Design an enzyme around this catalytic site. Structure first.
Site, PDB file in Angstrom:
ATOM      1  N   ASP A  66      13.140 -17.790 -25.380  1.00  0.00           N
ATOM      2  CA  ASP A  66      12.778 -16.373 -25.108  1.00  0.00           C
ATOM      3  C   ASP A  66      11.585 -16.293 -24.299  1.00  0.00           C
ATOM      4  O   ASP A  66      10.637 -17.037 -24.371  1.00  0.00           O
ATOM      5  CB  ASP A  66      12.576 -15.561 -26.496  1.00  0.00           C
ATOM      6  N   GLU A  67      11.550 -15.310 -23.363  1.00  0.00           N
ATOM      7  CA  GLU A  67      10.502 -15.102 -22.423  1.00  0.00           C
ATOM      8  C   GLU A  67       9.116 -15.198 -23.106  1.00  0.00           C
ATOM      9  O   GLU A  67       8.162 -15.790 -22.525  1.00  0.00           O
ATOM     10  CB  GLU A  67      10.631 -13.698 -21.758  1.00  0.00           C
ATOM     11  N   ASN A 110       0.754  -1.291   0.000  1.00  0.00           N
ATOM     12  CA  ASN A 110       0.000   0.000   0.000  1.00  0.00           C
ATOM     13  C   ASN A 110       0.756   1.295   0.000  1.00  0.00           C
ATOM     14  O   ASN A 110       0.181   2.314  -0.086  1.00  0.00           O
ATOM     15  CB  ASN A 110      -1.026   0.003   1.060  1.00  0.00           C
ATOM     16  N   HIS A 159      14.350 -16.045 -15.950  1.00  0.00           N
ATOM     17  CA  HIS A 159      14.286 -14.789 -16.657  1.00  0.00           C
ATOM     18  C   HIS A 159      13.620 -13.720 -15.830  1.00  0.00           C
ATOM     19  O   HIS A 159      12.969 -14.013 -14.919  1.00  0.00           O
ATOM     20  CB  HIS A 159      13.595 -14.971 -18.049  1.00  0.00           C
ATOM     21  N   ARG A 160      13.774 -12.475 -16.262  1.00  0.00           N
ATOM     22  CA  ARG A 160      13.609 -11.352 -15.339  1.00  0.00           C
ATOM     23  C   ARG A 160      12.897 -10.194 -16.217  1.00  0.00           C
ATOM     24  O   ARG A 160      13.278  -9.060 -16.356  1.00  0.00           O
ATOM     25  CB  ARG A 160      15.079 -10.955 -14.848  1.00  0.00           C
ATOM     26  N   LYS A 198      18.814 -20.667 -25.124  1.00  0.00           N
ATOM     27  CA  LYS A 198      17.715 -20.265 -24.352  1.00  0.00           C
ATOM     28  C   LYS A 198      16.438 -19.997 -25.053  1.00  0.00           C
ATOM     29  O   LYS A 198      16.547 -19.423 -26.158  1.00  0.00           O
ATOM     30  CB  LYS A 198      18.085 -19.098 -23.465  1.00  0.00           C
ATOM     31  N   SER A 207      23.030 -10.042 -20.873  1.00  0.00           N
ATOM     32  CA  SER A 207      22.478 -10.309 -22.221  1.00  0.00           C
ATOM     33  C   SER A 207      22.516  -8.973 -22.831  1.00  0.00           C
ATOM     34  O   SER A 207      23.241  -8.249 -22.309  1.00  0.00           O
ATOM     35  CB  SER A 207      20.996 -10.813 -22.119  1.00  0.00           C
ATOM     36  N   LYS A 234      16.993 -16.819 -32.580  1.00  0.00           N
ATOM     37  CA  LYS A 234      16.300 -15.803 -33.327  1.00  0.00           C
ATOM     38  C   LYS A 234      15.933 -16.294 -34.678  1.00  0.00           C
ATOM     39  O   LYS A 234      16.579 -17.244 -35.056  1.00  0.00           O
ATOM     40  CB  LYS A 234      17.202 -14.544 -33.507  1.00  0.00           C
ATOM     41  N   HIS A 273      19.477 -12.697 -14.805  1.00  0.00           N
ATOM     42  CA  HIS A 273      20.017 -11.710 -15.661  1.00  0.00           C
ATOM     43  C   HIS A 273      20.367 -10.614 -14.697  1.00  0.00           C
ATOM     44  O   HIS A 273      19.526 -10.366 -13.787  1.00  0.00           O
ATOM     45  CB  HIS A 273      19.011 -11.251 -16.613  1.00  0.00           C
TER      46      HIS A 273
END
Lengths: 86, 101, 426, 426, 101, 426, 426
Positions: free
Chosen positions: F182-183, F102, F273-274, F180, F352, F154, F306
């Site tokens: 990708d998110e 809050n 991941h972040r 990896k 990254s 990619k 990361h």
């Protein structure tokens, strides 16, 4: 010794706490690894200060940590990191 | 054929001088050497056979080299590797190849 | 060894585990050496090539203090601190195994007894504790302002489940809050547990209904196996049974923790019996003093514990220990180290062994409403005991010294209480 | 008391259970009344209206004979008889609960000392006992006509899971049969049990590839709770581990029996550590004797049992009890009672404690082939240990007396073996 | 018939003096009165209906007494309980009856 | 408010949780009152009858210091302390809920900006933490002395699972430690996860066969539902996958902490991941600092995290926090407080965002071997990347300065390495 | 960049997802090129050999409208198209990761926001949505013709579970249909969840039997981990509890969505709490505006949702977006897009923060009968607040203007209601 350390050890001794010191190199200091130092068996401020300064000089370029000990309880009441290698 | 190895494998085979340098660096960071070997090289097979002692009372790299020479004199057809262990951080910190058949 | 495991200037960190060992070393071994050895067995045992791979220091046990015992000869206390890294989190068993797994077996000591542990706060938070605690216990039972009443069915063996339930009914309805299985009873041919359960549950239901008072009987679930103990606990649940029982020290600490988990999740009040305890604690000169077992139990989790029939000072010490969330160090009551149980609920103390209802004012003064009183069985007797309890509670509650007026309150109570008048006659 | 519970003339039923009690009463109390009381507190305790709704007569602790102890004063051996119906079937916990639940706390005894029980063949027959037994274990593991070899990993704690497994591998390839967890290591933060088991398993596999002899490591599974034990045990089995390790006193006898069942169903050998046993046996006036614990465990089930490094009499008695099917009463070796086990499989004894391979020929002399020798450690030292073991066995087989020739034997063995010669130099 | 109440209900019906002295000692340890009322008393029933506020600003038991007059006078066929709460120990330490129908 | 929450002389206990709040009070709002107010918002907010059934004492948040920011106006760092007892054990979600639930909406403060928290040791010990930790990670993955490599497939969308593996395969064989997800890429209608799993796994397996090094990919498991997230999870297990990936900001912390528990139970590395973070952190005058999230995460448990491509000084601050056991207070590097972790293992940094390998000697210098490097995609390129990494490792261990001498190292590596020669030639 | 991620003339397809962004770029970067980039990093990031094996052009995020923000410099509004194939079916987390995962970190924007999305009807469908919504919730609660009324339970922390059920009882018997947990309450050690739930449950059953109208309390199930969180939902269901609480920012989406399915499967109403909500949307320049969150929630699922205290025009915007199933694109209300919701059942908004009972006429003329009006405390106050509510509902229904007659109606209500008279007195 710095003034702020002097004023800390005065405050600790005034209360009747004993003084001890522990030393460790940079790698043990990273890992919270400390070793016993030479015992300071003296309640007089001057002699305590002198033995602390001698112990600092003993372990140049190592972490030194100063602490407050209550003999009666046998428990720690203060933590303070006094010196660093740099 | 194309078989590689964990660390430094894409460099040219380390010269004795290069191995010494690496051992030297290990010493100054206090990671006493461990020498170990196996007639084959399997990535799944985590362990290797240790060369009869880890050299904790190591002062010079040339002792570790001389150890390595004894090992290849006895096991010249066997890969040889040197390891460094950080007893304070409790971590293996070095692992690379020195010999191949 | 002293040079390696005696650091007199060391002071423990708040995250250490401190163990007080009383020792009478074998002749020829100085007391300091003996405390260095003690520190050594449990925190190292002991060279080997593997030694130096690790940092030995971190994983050593320091005896940071040695003193002799006042008024005893050849006797000392060792106070030894333990790094928190040494033990698995939430495992009483592992703690015991590290501290006392093999130091007891050592030769140089003639006799050793573990006195007390100061489990660091951090280590306390890894144990859920008592499944409910005193307060939740009081809330669930909705009883307030008086110590509880417990009785055991007699004889310990022979009663039919139907007759056994008879007995339990008479005991409850006469005005005892609580009834209990005998520790021995788990499935004996004469009484199988499930029929025991269904009888006695229905008795407590009928005593409930008639009284209008939540009633409780301690059902044993000590069982040969884990899975069995799970079934008995389950079947206690399904009958709405507000409490069960276990015999931790025989069965196990790991099974007890398991029971702790099950009951906590299922909201089930736990009682703990204290069988075998004299095998360890009876001897003041060797073994383990019971306060350790108590603190280990409450780390494992249990809402009740036999506190004995009553050294009164050491009673008060460890009874406080296992009620109060914070205790200060004091050697008159025995307490070796200041301990903080981090708001964790305390456990109810249970008094048994011929509580001699004429002594009940003594117990009530000793222990306070946060305590349970167990008789060691007919409806009038249980009424009388309850009356007396209430009569003494009122008397202290208006301000009367229980101690000096206990008899006067009894007579007063028995004036308006026939059943208590008859029990007083006894 | 004596009028009802002392029966000096009663002869015990094959279906009774007999308990041996050495004890010192408090001054004034006669011995007979002391034994009578002992029996009472174990059986019936103490009158109530419910007493006579049973055939009271049926459910006694019958103290039926006594003697003083030769060469000691105020110390007397009692034997008490127990009907079979007193106890649940298959519950080690229960048998110990009634035998020693509360009698040790009985006041009038100066000291009490439980020494033996003779479990009636019926009461034997309901326990599962060791999951496999000596023979079935040897059949599994293929190790024949010799004792097995074990080395405990050092230092007890500190080692990385990777190093820990490295040490395992050394020890196993050098020729040891087995490697063990320290009893203490269950999940300490610096070693998470799962990574340890994976390391160990892969190490055994690769040693077994090397050597061509069955290798296994005694993986501890003692855990804070039952579910955690079951998980660890499931995991262990998923890797094909042949054996595990448990600490039955610390963890308990219920959790132990659970594990023994699960292993019986899962094919997995079981090792028992006796940590804390010292707290119960060390003193010669108080406590429960290691032999009884051994009965109770082999009734529960386990394939190994520590039995000390090695009074030699007692050692030899209770190891024979835990090995053989039939033994005969012998006060000299401590075997009070004549026990038969109806062919229930044996357990392998384990001896440890820095066992000074110079003294190993003594150990083979004492123990015989069906045993396990543990050592408290690098690959050469293990090879030296193995060659000495094999030489010693060969010599015993041949005829050379081990006691008079052990040093010489080790001579000749070392002359051709360098690792043994170096070890003997130490 | 035999319905009984959890605390003190083995003793004679609490007279005004007895309740007053109960409250008096309750306040000696800082407990502030509570009043709740119910038409029934069931052992399963933890909660009763609250008497329009708890008397946290207690100075004399007599106010709570006249409070209980009035609770009677509006709920004179209902059960009346008094309680006190240890906000320090976070433990309820009193719960007993003062009125029956 | 200020009369109570603001306790200037109040000494923090070891058992309190400490928070640093940079905040900008609205004009006319005093700083002191602002700090009181922020302490109330996250402790108690604001009287009603119930307020005095509780000792408010014990459960207020205490603002014990305010300072103005050097070189900024109207902005003040607030430090607040909390008792441990506000927090369920082992719930980071509760951490956040109480600190930040809050305060952020509070109307007296133009901008509120969390910086730093201190977790006390006891509240630490309640969480599991990272499933394996650095060292156990390195032990399972069997690589040492170097930081690791990572590439991201990619284009993030449209590669058929066959193709997508085919890319994975080229990345790995060229000498990357890790690929990896990708998110975003979780089961897209063009890429269903199951098939993606199957093909990528088989691609790791065959690369491992060819190369003989342990290869792994980071397999996203963030899923719409807890149970979806599970099934994904197990089926990554069944294929032997050593590591997975989870977006936890978007998914939360409770699901993440489950996942850390699952993985700890099943031996599975957990990459983190972040994503969605700049929604919170990037702004410098309002929001929560990445070190806090990283603390919180790792308390939840996670092997990789990361930390940014790289303020380098704040980077060093939180990185040194999320790896080392003890760190000291440094406002120059942004660490308000002093923290301890009692041997709880740290978490590996990941960088990254176009690492651009010609800057890689800088990255090795900055971070050290205990770190992982993400490339923002053919087999020679990956080879060149790896060659550079190995060359720079070698140079650094040679004592040659990385910073100064990067270009020379990279030339000498390229002379003998055509694929690095070409990569440098770009 | 522009030439591939700027499509000004592109009319979005019906199936497109549209996301409106507010941004302030860096000095130098033109608005269009910032727009091409913002488009870009959300879909495609950036070339690689794996590129021409894909249909990039298909999965490109197309920026088809840029405008400046009226009366503002260095700010503009962007609309970008994103093919439906771009996000995983019924996965909220993944859409937020995609759209908002790293786009906040792109250095070329000084400040960015996500202001709205258009969830196309087809992408709307997949999400399970609220477990029950408005009309079913009203059914399940049998309430119509007026908005529901709640109080928050105070003090936020310190109660005993018995005291917290007391308080709840008094608020429910006050005249509030509903009560609630404080978001800072899941398992606090002094008061555990299982006691709380049992207590509050009892208290409601007592309220229902007392009034005969549906009574309930929002209970909190938020946990450290998913598994205990199911266990809480299950336990709550077991007690006939109508509705629960969740904290969708501190535990995230996949957690609430699990609960949404579980609730729909369990007939137990769901609440959504908004702890941390000010972290994201609060500032006027950055973050994500709150209606996106609300909409995402509606997709994921929750019966209830806080809306704050109350700008107005946007307020009503997102209130409508979460109640009506077609809302026209309305700039001035911050509705950037038209939202066909597929008949998707709406959400009941929850207004809280000291609702200041004097102001309800404006509240509920703002929010309507289909709204929940939650209050931040004894029975009389709640009855008064119900009075006032019913008075104002009648007064609108019979034709009275509330905005102007609020005082008149309130007074008139208070004339026959002494409780609303005492409430207007204060």
């Amino acid at each position: 010794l710095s003034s702020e350390v002097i004023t800390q050890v005065r405050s600790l001794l005034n209360q009747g706490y004993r003084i001890g010191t522990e030393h460790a190199d940079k790698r043990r200091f990273r890992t919270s690894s400390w070793q016993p130092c030479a015992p300071i068996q003296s309640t007089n401020e001057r002699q305590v200060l002198s033995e602390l300064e001698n112990c600092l000089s003993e372990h140049e370029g190592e972490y030194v940590r100063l602490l407050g000990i209550d003999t009666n309880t046998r428990s720690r009441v203060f933590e303070a990191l006094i010196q660093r290698p740099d | 054929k194309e078989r590689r190895f964990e660390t430094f494998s894409y460099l040219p085979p380390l010269s004795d001088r290069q191995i010494a340098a690496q051992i030297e660096y290990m010493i100054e960071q206090g990671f006493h050497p461990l020498i170990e070997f196996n007639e084959h090289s399997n990535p799944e097979e985590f362990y290797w056979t240790m060369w009869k002692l880890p050299l904790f009372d190591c002062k010079s790299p040339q002792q570790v080299l001389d150890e390595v020479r004894e090992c290849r004199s006895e096991y010249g057809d066997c890969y040889i590797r040197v390891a460094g262990f950080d007893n304070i951080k409790q971590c293996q910190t070095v692992s690379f190849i020195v010999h191949r058949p | 060894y002293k040079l390696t495991y005696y650091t007199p200037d060391y002071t423990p960190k708040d995250t250490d585990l401190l163990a007080a060992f009383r020792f009478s070393p074998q002749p020829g071994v100085p007391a300091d050496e003996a405390g260095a050895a003690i520190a050594a067995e449990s925190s190292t045992g002991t060279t080997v090539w593997t030694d130096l791979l690790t940092d030995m220091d971190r994983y050593k046990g320091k005896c940071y203090h040695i003193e002799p015992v006042q008024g005893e000869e050849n006797s000392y206390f060792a106070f030894i601190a333990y790094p928190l890294d040494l033990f698995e989190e939430g495992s009483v068993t592992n703690i015991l195994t590290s501290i006392v797994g093999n130091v007891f077996g050592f030769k140089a000591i003639r006799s050793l007894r573990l006195e007390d542990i100061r489990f660091p706060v951090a280590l306390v938070k890894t144990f859920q504790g008592p499944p409910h605690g005193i307060q939740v216990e009081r809330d669930l039972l909705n009883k307030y302002g008086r110590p509880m009443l417990g009785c055991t069915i007699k004889p310990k063996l022979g009663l039919s489940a139907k007759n056994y339930g008879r007995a339990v009914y008479e005991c409850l309805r006469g005005g005892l809050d609580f009834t209990k299985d005998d520790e021995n009873i788990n499935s004996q041919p004469f009484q199988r547990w499930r029929d025991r359960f269904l009888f006695v549950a229905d008795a407590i239901h009928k005593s409930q209904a008639e009284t209008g008072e939540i009633k409780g009987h301690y059902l044993n679930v000590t069982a040969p196996t884990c899975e069995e103990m799970m079934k008995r606990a389950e079947f206690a649940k399904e009958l709405g049974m507000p409490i069960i029982m276990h015999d931790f020290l025989t069965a196990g600490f790991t099974a007890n923790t398991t029971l702790a988990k099950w009951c906590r999740d299922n909201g089930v009040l736990l009682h703990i019996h204290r069988a075998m305890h004299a095998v360890i604690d009876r001897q003041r000169n060797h073994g383990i003093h019971f306060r350790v077992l108590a603190k280990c139990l409450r780390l494992s989790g249990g809402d009740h514990l036999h506190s004995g029939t009553v050294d009164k000072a050491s009673t008060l010490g460890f009874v406080d220990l296992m009620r109060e969330d914070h205790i200060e160090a004091d050697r008159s009551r025995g307490v070796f180290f200041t301990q903080d149980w981090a708001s964790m609920p305390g456990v109810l103390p249970v008094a048994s062994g011929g509580i001699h209802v004429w002594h009940m004012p003594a117990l009530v003064e000793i222990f306070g409403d946060d305590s349970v009183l167990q008789f060691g069985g007919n409806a009038p007797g249980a009424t009388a005991n309850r009356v007396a309890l209430e009569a003494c509670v009122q008397a202290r509650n208006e301000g009367r010294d229980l101690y000096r007026e206990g008899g006067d309150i009894l007579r007063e109570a028995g004036k308006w209480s026939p059943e208590l008048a008859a029990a007083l006659d006894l």
